[PDB]
Amino acid sequence: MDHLPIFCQLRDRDCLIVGGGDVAERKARLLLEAGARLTVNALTFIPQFTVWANEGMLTLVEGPFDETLLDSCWLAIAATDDDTVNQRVSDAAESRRIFCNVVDAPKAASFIMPSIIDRSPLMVAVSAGGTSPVLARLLREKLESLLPQHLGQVARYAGQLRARVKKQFATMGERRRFWEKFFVNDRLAQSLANADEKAVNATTERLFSEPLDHRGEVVLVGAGPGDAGLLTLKGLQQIQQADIVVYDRLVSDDIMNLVRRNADRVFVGKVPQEEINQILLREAQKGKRVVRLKGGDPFIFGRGGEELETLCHAGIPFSVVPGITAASGCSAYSGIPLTHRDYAQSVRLVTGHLKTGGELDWENLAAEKQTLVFYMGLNQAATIQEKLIAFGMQADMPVALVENGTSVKQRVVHGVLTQLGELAQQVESPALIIVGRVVALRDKLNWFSNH
Amino acid sequence: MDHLPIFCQLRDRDCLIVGGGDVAERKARLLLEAGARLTVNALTFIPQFTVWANEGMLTLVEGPFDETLLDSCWLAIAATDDDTVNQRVSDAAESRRIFCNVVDAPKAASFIMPSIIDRSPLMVAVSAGGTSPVLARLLREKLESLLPQHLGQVARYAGQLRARVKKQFATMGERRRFWEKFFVNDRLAQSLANADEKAVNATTERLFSEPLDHRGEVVLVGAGPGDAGLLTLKGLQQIQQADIVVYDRLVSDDIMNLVRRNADRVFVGKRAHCVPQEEINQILLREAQKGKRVVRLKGGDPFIFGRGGEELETLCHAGIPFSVVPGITAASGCSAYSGIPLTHRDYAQSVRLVTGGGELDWENLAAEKQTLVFYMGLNQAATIQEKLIAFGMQADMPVALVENGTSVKQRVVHGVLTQLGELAQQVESPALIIVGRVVALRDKLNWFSNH
Ligand SMILES: Nc1ncnc2c1ncn2[C@@H]1O[C@H](CSCC[C@H](N)C(=O)O)[C@@H](O)[C@H]1O
Ligand SMILES: Nc1ncnc2c1ncn2[C@@H]1O[C@H](CSCC[C@H](N)C(=O)O)[C@@H](O)[C@H]1O
C-alpha cells in the first residue's frame, strides 16, 4: 500500500504549521480540534490567525522559517506558496524524523491529510494520495450517505460499556457476540438518539442477560474460481469475521486479501484429506469461528462432503456458503455459455482424474446435445480425445481449454476435438476442458480479453 | 476531534515492532505491505519472522527491549503480552516523539491502528478510537463489498489523465460528470487490470468521443438462487451503478431490495400473458441505445438455462458493449442449503444439469455414477420416474426435490425414485429434482432448516 493510515493522539503535543494563508488556516483548524499545541510560523497571517492567537489557542511566530521551531514537534505542515520554503521545512522535518505534510505537493514529504467523515468518536478517512482528489470526494459523499448520524452515539455508548463487557464476559468470543448484537440493534440506536434512558437501560440489561453461544463453528465457503469480485456477499462476511481461515492453493491471492487481517491463516495445499478434517475439527473445538475457504463451490469435486461428515460425527455446528464453480466462472469469462438454444440439453460436470481403475462411461459422455466440462482432466486430455472420438463424438466438435479462468492471467485455447491432446500441452493447471457446440459462440460473446 | 487521521509514507522509514508472536506478525505484515524498513525486537520469534528475515524482508533483534532501537525510528508498535514491556516501549517512544501504538491498549499510546480498506493509491480507514473495534470491522466489511478490487488502477490512471480532462471540459460541472462515468466504466477497469494496453486507449479515446450523457452498456448479472447473500460482490457493485435494472420473477425480492433508489426498474417476467424472449432482447437493446447503464438481472447463473447467450447475441450485432457477472446456479445453491452435495467420494463421476423443449436421452440419464439435476422438470416428473425405472435405474435410488432453494421458504422433500411422481405434486415452481446417491447424505449434512 502507498500509505499507512494511522489515527494520531495529538492532545498537548506540539505541532508546527509554516505559512499563514488560507491553506494554513484549514489545517490549523484541524489540528486545533484534535487538541494539538500549535505553533504557526509565517511572514504574514490572514485575520483568522489573529482571532485564534488572542483566544490563546495557538502561538504565532511572525517571520521567516525557523527550523528550531521543529525541535519539540510531532507533526509539521508546510503550507506556504513558496516551494523553496516548503522544501526547507520538509528537509528540516526529515532530519528530525518528524512526519511532515507539504500541502501543495502530496508526493513529497511524509504524510497526507485525508478527507474525513466525522461521526465522533467514529471516524472514516479517505484519500487517493493526491493521484485523484475527485475520486476521494466522490467516495467521501457516498460514505456520508451510508453512515447514519446516530452512529456516533452508538459508538460512544459502546466505549462506556467496554469495562462492563470485559468484566462480565470471560472469553473473547462471548464478548464479540455481545458486540455483534449490540451494533445491529436498531431500537438501541434509536433510544440513544432520543436520549430515552429507560429504554436504553431495558435493552442493555436484556442484552447482558442473553445466553451467548459457546460453540465453535466451521463454515465451508466457496471462494469462486479466482476473481475476488466473484466471492458472494455472505462469503465475504464469513472471512471478514473468521478467527481462522483454512485455505488451499486454488483460492486466489486476491480473495486472500479480503480475509480479516486479524485472522490466522493455515495453508493446506501441495496434504491429503484426512489431515484437513483434523485441522478443522481441532480448531473448531477451541470455540473459534473457522472458515474452510475452498476454490469454486465446496460441493462440486471439492470433497466438501467429507469435511462435513467428520464435524457431524463430532457435534460441531457448520454451514455452507456456495460459490461460483469453475464451470460457471470460465463460461462467463471465456464467452462460452454452458447452455444455449438447443445446442445443449444437458451440462455435464465430469472429473478427469478418477478412483483406482474406475473408467468414465465414455459412450454416455459422447452423446450429442450436451456440453462437457472436465475438471482436473489436463493430464488425461489425450485419453479424453481418443475415447470421445471412439464412442462417436464428431471429430470437428469444438473444444476449448480455459486456464486460470476469471483471473487477469486467464488463457483460453480452442479448436476441435482432434486437437484436444495438442491443445492441452499449451496450458497448465488449473484448467477446464469444455467440449461442445457452445464453444463456437466464443467469438461473438467474448467480452473479457484476448489474454 | 479525538484522533487526527493521517496517511503516512513509510517506504524505507525505520519502524520498530516489539514482540514476536501472532499479534506482532499481523502488525509486521501491515508495515511490510506499506514498505517500512522494519526491525522486530522480541524475546522469541514465531517462524514467520525468521522466514521474513531469511528473505531480507526485515531485521530481527533477539533479546529484551532495547530503547536505542528507537534512535532512528519513525513509528513504534508495542505488540507483546507483557504490560510492563509495552509500557517501557511506549514511554521510550514518547520521550523521543515517536508515534507509538500499544496493540492491546489503544488509549495508552499516541496512535490507533484503524481498519484499512486498501485500493492503493485509494485508501479508506475506519476507527472509533478503541471504543468499538467490532463496529469498525462491520463498516470495513460493508466498504470492502462496495469498492471494486481494481479501483486503485482506475485511480492511478485518472491521475495521468487530469491534464487532458481539464483542457477539454470548460465548466467544472462537466469535468465531474466525466469522472463519474470514468470511475464506473467496466471495460476501462477490466482493460486496466488485464494490461490490455490498447483496449485501454481504445476505451479512453472513446470516453472523450462519446457525448457526456452516454454511458450505454449492458451487464448480465446472475442473481443467484434467492438468498440476497448469494449475490457476488461484483454483482452488487454493478447493481449499485445501474441506471436501469431489467429483471424477472425468478429474481428474489431480497435481491431487488439491493438495487438503489433512483434506478429505473423494468419487469419483464410473467404477468399471468407469456412474454417471448425477443421482446426482452429488444428492451435491453432499446434501453442501452438511449445511452443508459443497463443491468439484466437473471435468477441463478445467466449462462445455465437462462437464455443469456440469446440476449448477448442481440447486443453484439448492434455494437453495444456488454459483460457478464456469473451467479450461483440453482443446483449449487440448493445443494449447499439442502445438505445434498452434488459430488461425494465416488458416488458420482459426473453431475448432469438437464432441462425438463426437447427429447430426453433416457438410456443416458439412467446410467450409474451420476448426480442428476432437473431444471424446470416438475411437469415431466411423472414421466421421469417411469422412464428411469424402465431404463434400469434402481428403484431405491434416492431422490430429492428442493423448492425455493436458499430462501426463507425453502421446502425439501425426499424419498426414493419410485415415489418421485408423488413427491413432485407436493412442491411447486421453482423446484429442482435431484436424483442420485448423494441425496442420502442430506440426513447428515442438512444445516439449513426446512420450511
Ligand atoms: N480458475 C480456474 N480455471 C480453470 N479451471 C479451474 C479453475 N479453478 C478450478 N478449476 C478446475 O477445478 C479443478 C479442481 S477440482 C475443485 C473445483 C471447485 N470445487 C469448483 O467448484 O470449481 C482444477 O483441476 C481445474 O480443472
Ligand atoms: N431458488 C430455486 N430453488 C429451486 N429451483 C430453482 C431455484 N431457482 C431456479 N430454479 C430452477 O431453475 C429453473 C428456471 S431456468 C433458470 C435457472 C437459472 N439460470 C439458474 O442458473 O439456476 C426453475 O424451473 C427451477 O427448476
Numbering used by the authors:
A (entry chain A): 1 to 270, 277 to 457
B (entry chain B): 1 to 272, 275 to 358, 363 to 457
Quote from the publication.
Siroheme is the modified isobacteriochlorin tetrapyrrole used by siroheme-dependent sulfite and nitrite reductases (SiR/NiRs) in catalyzing the six-electron reduction of sulfite to sulfide or nitrite to ammonia. The N-terminal enzyme module, CysGB, is a three-domain bifunctional dehydrogenase/ATP-independent class III ferrochelatase12 that performs the final two steps of siroheme biosynthesis. The C-terminal enzyme module, CysGA, is homologous to a well-studied class of SAM-dependent uro’gen III methyltransferases (SUMTs) that catalyzes the methylations to generate precorrin-210,13.
D262 comes from the CysGA module, opposing D104 but adjacent to R260/R261 and sitting above the tetrapyrrole nitrogens. Therefore, we wanted to know if D262 from CysGA was important for catalysis, so we altered it to an alanine or an asparagine (D262A or D262N). No gross structural defects were apparent. Both complemented cysG deficiency, but the altered enzymes produced the fluorescent intermediate, with defects in the dehydrogenase and chelatase activities. D262N was more affected by increasing Co2+ than CysG. R261A, D262A, and D262N retain some activity for both chemistries. Given that both D262 variants retain activity, however, and its absence from Met8p, we conclude that in CysG, D262 is not strictly required. It does, however, interact with an arginine that directly binds the sirohydrochlorin, so helps form the active site to bind the tetrapyrrole in the correct orientation. P133G behaves similarly to D262N: strongly affected by increasing cobalt concentrations.
